[PDB]
Structure formats: structure tokens, C-alpha cells
Design an enzyme around this catalytic site. Structure first.
Site, PDB file in Angstrom:
ATOM      1  CG  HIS A  40     -18.943 -11.625 -60.726  1.00 31.58           C
ATOM      2  ND1 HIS A  40     -18.503 -11.644 -59.454  1.00 31.58           N
ATOM      3  CD2 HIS A  40     -19.224 -10.311 -61.026  1.00 31.58           C
ATOM      4  CE1 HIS A  40     -18.495 -10.423 -58.975  1.00 31.58           C
ATOM      5  NE2 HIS A  40     -18.927  -9.625 -59.930  1.00 31.58           N
ATOM      6  CG  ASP A  84     -17.900 -14.660 -57.945  1.00 31.08           C
ATOM      7  OD1 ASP A  84     -17.241 -14.622 -58.997  1.00 31.08           O
ATOM      8  OD2 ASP A  84     -18.613 -13.718 -57.588  1.00 31.08           O
ATOM      9  N   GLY A 175     -18.676  -2.496 -59.886  1.00 27.64           N
ATOM     10  CA  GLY A 175     -17.381  -1.875 -60.107  1.00 27.64           C
ATOM     11  C   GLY A 175     -16.376  -2.305 -59.027  1.00 27.64           C
ATOM     12  CB  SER A 177     -17.189  -6.973 -59.291  1.00 22.74           C
ATOM     13  OG  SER A 177     -18.473  -6.373 -59.252  1.00 22.74           O
ATOM     14  N   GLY A 178     -14.711  -8.377 -57.450  1.00 22.95           N
ATOM     15  CA  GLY A 178     -13.383  -8.958 -57.493  1.00 22.95           C
ATOM     16  C   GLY A 178     -12.430  -8.336 -56.509  1.00 22.95           C
TER      17      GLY A 178
HETATM   18  N1  LIG Z   1     -20.047  -6.901 -67.609  1.00 22.86           N
HETATM   19  C1  LIG Z   1     -19.253  -7.489 -66.699  1.00 22.86           C
HETATM   20  N2  LIG Z   1     -18.187  -8.186 -67.157  1.00 22.86           N
HETATM   21  C2  LIG Z   1     -19.580  -7.359 -65.323  1.00 22.86           C
HETATM   22  C3  LIG Z   1     -18.622  -7.632 -64.309  1.00 22.86           C
HETATM   23  C4  LIG Z   1     -18.975  -7.626 -62.937  1.00 22.86           C
HETATM   24  C5  LIG Z   1     -20.304  -7.343 -62.591  1.00 22.86           C
HETATM   25  N3  LIG Z   1     -20.841  -7.293 -61.363  1.00 22.86           N
HETATM   26  C6  LIG Z   1     -22.108  -6.995 -61.622  1.00 22.86           C
HETATM   27  C7  LIG Z   1     -23.113  -6.885 -60.613  1.00 22.86           C
HETATM   28  O1  LIG Z   1     -24.265  -7.225 -60.935  1.00 22.86           O
HETATM   29  C8  LIG Z   1     -22.886  -6.604 -59.232  1.00 22.86           C
HETATM   30  N4  LIG Z   1     -21.694  -6.752 -58.673  1.00 22.86           N
HETATM   31  C9  LIG Z   1     -21.939  -6.424 -57.400  1.00 22.86           C
HETATM   32  C10 LIG Z   1     -21.023  -6.406 -56.353  1.00 22.86           C
HETATM   33  C11 LIG Z   1     -21.509  -6.024 -55.080  1.00 22.86           C
HETATM   34  C12 LIG Z   1     -22.865  -5.667 -54.850  1.00 22.86           C
HETATM   35  C13 LIG Z   1     -23.363  -5.450 -53.546  1.00 22.86           C
HETATM   36  N5  LIG Z   1     -24.498  -4.809 -53.379  1.00 22.86           N
HETATM   37  N6  LIG Z   1     -22.751  -5.873 -52.425  1.00 22.86           N
HETATM   38  C14 LIG Z   1     -23.725  -5.716 -55.986  1.00 22.86           C
HETATM   39  C15 LIG Z   1     -23.246  -6.096 -57.241  1.00 22.86           C
HETATM   40  N7  LIG Z   1     -23.874  -6.202 -58.418  1.00 22.86           N
HETATM   41  N8  LIG Z   1     -22.414  -6.843 -62.908  1.00 22.86           N
HETATM   42  C16 LIG Z   1     -21.250  -7.075 -63.528  1.00 22.86           C
HETATM   43  C17 LIG Z   1     -20.915  -7.077 -64.891  1.00 22.86           C
HETATM   44 CO   LIG Z   2     -19.945  -7.396 -59.779  1.00 23.93          CO
END
Ligand SMILES: N=C(N)c1ccc2nc(C(=O)c3nc4ccc(C(=N)N)cc4[nH]3)[nH]c2c1
Ligand SMILES: [Co+2]
Ligand SMILES: [Ca+2]
Length: 223
Positions: A40, A84, A175, A177-178
Site C-alpha cells: 500500500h 501487503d 506515516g 506504513s511499511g
Molecule cells: N497516499 C499514500 N500513498 C498512502 C500511503 C500509506 C497510507 N497508509 C494509510 C493509512 O490509511 C493508514 N496506515 C496505517 C498504518 C497503521 C495504522 C494503525 N492504526 N495501526 C493505521 C493506518 N492507516 N494511508 C496511506 C496513504
Molecule cells: Co499506511
């Protein structure tokens, strides 16, 4: 990271910032040519930033390298976020050292109750927004699959685990993420999704890397 702490400059030397004009996702260096992050987080035009502490100040330890190719998992579903995971190849090998180091892939999956370190430059506020400039860290346990699957009915697959605190207050966030989840010195998780950040009864869900070690090993060797 909501409710964690400042890690310390380059104390997580395998942590990567994916940048396309700004930080948008974290990642993990798994050897001098390869980074693993989330599917993602796919974008075209990624620069991998290694040796980072403050992502807004150049401080002496960073290596900025461009991605030569990106491989999203063949069975990634963007609606459910199953599988993912994505692999990113560096245009040139990183120089490993004290501040840029790689992380081991697991030989087996970790059990519930294991403590892990999660880290990133993602949002710090659960109801609100505040983005940090230095790396934040959070110590969190892997949770039982039953309490993972009760919090998210019919959404958890075999390729997913929960880690966090059911009382809320502490979690990964957008933020992050990954980014990495490391338990007993192996990369066991990838920051994937949850519901809001740090809400009670809504823990983070993470890609269960031990299911992918074979696909990783095989893809990096023929690419
Ligand atoms: N515009 C993009 N390219 C982008 C990239 C990654 C994203 N990730 C989200 C995103 O929706 C998101 N990543 C999450 C990671 C952890 C948690 C958590 N509560 N454990 C929640 C999250 N919500 N929106 C995103 C948008
Ligand atoms: Co994310
Ligand atoms: Ca910097």
C-alpha cells in the site's frame, strides 16, 4: 507512532524513509541492495533514505539512493490489504556500517506475548495530527489471534497479526506504513493497517513476514 518515545539517532540502523519529495512510508533494509516495505506504500519515483534520524535536517549519516525497481506481492489485494508487502531494489548498494545496517528475516513466526519494536516518522496524535521529525519507537507485544479477529470480524487473514495494546493509547499510525516490527532480532512484521491510531480495542495489524521469506529470497535472487 502514538504513545512511543524518541529512539535515539541511528539506534534503529535498519530503518529506511521512503521519500518522493517528502517522507510518505517507512521500510526495512534487508541487505545492501534490497528494502522491504508495504504494497500500500507503492508509488512511482521513490528515493530510499538510509542513516536518517531527523528527516528534515542532513546530519551527516544519511545515504539517499534511488529505487531501480519495485515488486509488489503478486497476490496483494488493495481492498483487504492481504499480502501487503513490496520489495524495492537500490540503484546502488548501500554502504553498511554502524548507522546503516540490515535486519534478519525470520526462520519461524513469533508467538503471541513476544515483545517487538515498531518505529517510524508517522503521526503521533490519535485524535489529531502532529508529525515528528525524528524517529519514534514503541515496544509492543504480538497479540492472540482471537483478540485480533474479535476486534476486526472477518478481516484478518493468515498473513496478518495484531500487535499493540487493547486499552489503546499506544500504536503505529499513518506515516509508519511499511516500517519494521522486530521481535527477537528478526523482521516479523510490516506496519500495515488498523482503525484510527491507538483507539481502545482497535490494535495495529501487521503483515506476517515469516509467511513470505521464501518469496523474498527467491525474488531478490532473480532480480
Ligand atoms: N497516499 C499514500 N500513498 C498512502 C500511503 C500509506 C497510507 N497508509 C494509510 C493509512 O490509511 C493508514 N496506515 C496505517 C498504518 C497503521 C495504522 C494503525 N492504526 N495501526 C493505521 C493506518 N492507516 N494511508 C496511506 C496513504
Ligand atoms: Co499506511
Ligand atoms: Ca537527516
Amino acid at each position: 507512532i502514538v504513545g512511543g518515545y524518541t529512539c535515539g539517532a541511528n539506534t534503529v540502523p535498519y530503518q529506511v524513509s521512503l521519500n518522493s519529495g517528502y517522507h510518505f512510508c517507512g521500510g526495512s533494509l534487508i541487505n545492501s541492495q534490497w528494502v522491504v516495505s508495504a504494497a500500500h506504500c507503492y508509488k512511482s519515483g521513490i528515493q530510499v533514505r538510509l542513516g536518517e534520524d531527523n528527516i528534515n535536517v542532513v546530519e551527516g549519516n544519511e545515504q539517499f539512493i534511488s529505487a531501480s525497481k519495485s515488486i509488489v506481492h503478486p497476490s496483494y489485494n488493495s481492498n483487504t490489504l492481504n499480502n501487503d508487502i513490496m520489495l524495492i531494489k537500490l540503484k546502488s548498494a548501500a554502504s553498511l556500517n554502524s548507522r546503516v545496517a540490515s535486519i534478519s528475516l525470520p526462520t519461524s513466526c513469533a508467538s503471541a506475548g513476544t515483545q517487538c519494536l515498531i518505529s517510524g516518522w508517522g503521526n503521533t496524535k490519535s485524535s489529531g495530527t502532529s508529525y515528528p521529525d525524528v524517529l519514534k519507537c514503541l515496544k509492543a507485544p504480538i497479540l492472540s489471534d482471537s483478540s485480533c479477529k474479535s476486534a476486526y470480524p472477518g478481516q484478518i487473514t493468515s498473513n496478518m497479526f495484531c500487535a499493540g495494546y487493547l486499552e489503546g493509547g499506544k500504536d503505529s499510525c499513518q506515516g509508519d506504513s511499511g516500517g519494521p516490527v522486530v521481535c527477537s532480532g528478526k523482521l516479523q512484521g510490516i506496519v500495515s493497517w488498523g482503525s484510527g491510531c491507538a483507539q481502545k480495542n482497535k490494535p495495529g495489524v501487521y503483515t506476517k513476514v515469516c509467511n513470505y521469506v521464501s518469496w523474498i529470497k527467491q525474488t531478490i535472487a532473480s532480480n
